[PDB]
Amino acid sequence: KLTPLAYKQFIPNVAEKTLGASGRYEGKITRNSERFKELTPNYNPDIIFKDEENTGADRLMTQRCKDKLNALAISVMNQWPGVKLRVTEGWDEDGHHSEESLHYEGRAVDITTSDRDRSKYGMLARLAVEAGFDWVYYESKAHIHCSVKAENSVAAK
């Protein structure tokens, strides 16, 4: 049934910013920016947020990102009861990602299972695809990168 993604594999098998995947980068969103209004905090009790910066930034994301993440939170517990979805990186306020990263606009999250059992990540990535994320990439052994389209792209003119 559900086949895990392999290390470095991405679904769909196209570049992230293509229309069939997560679409175009709309630009960085910062706390001081006009675009900040676009982000809403996700306080789903079934999701662990690393929040290493202690700023709550990992929780701020677009509605579509929230929707897909919330659906994934359900499938993770269904796949491994007692284990929760965990976000290690979300909206990046400090340039820790490549130029034009969707993390800069709350459209991407790096995830793991709460038990940090890396053998579960290929399968987690698959659940992420079934959860509706527009692009899922088994980026590193430490996490799965998941991104979504901007609302402008979901209903493109």
Ligand SMILES: [Zn+2]
């Ligand atoms: Zn990422």
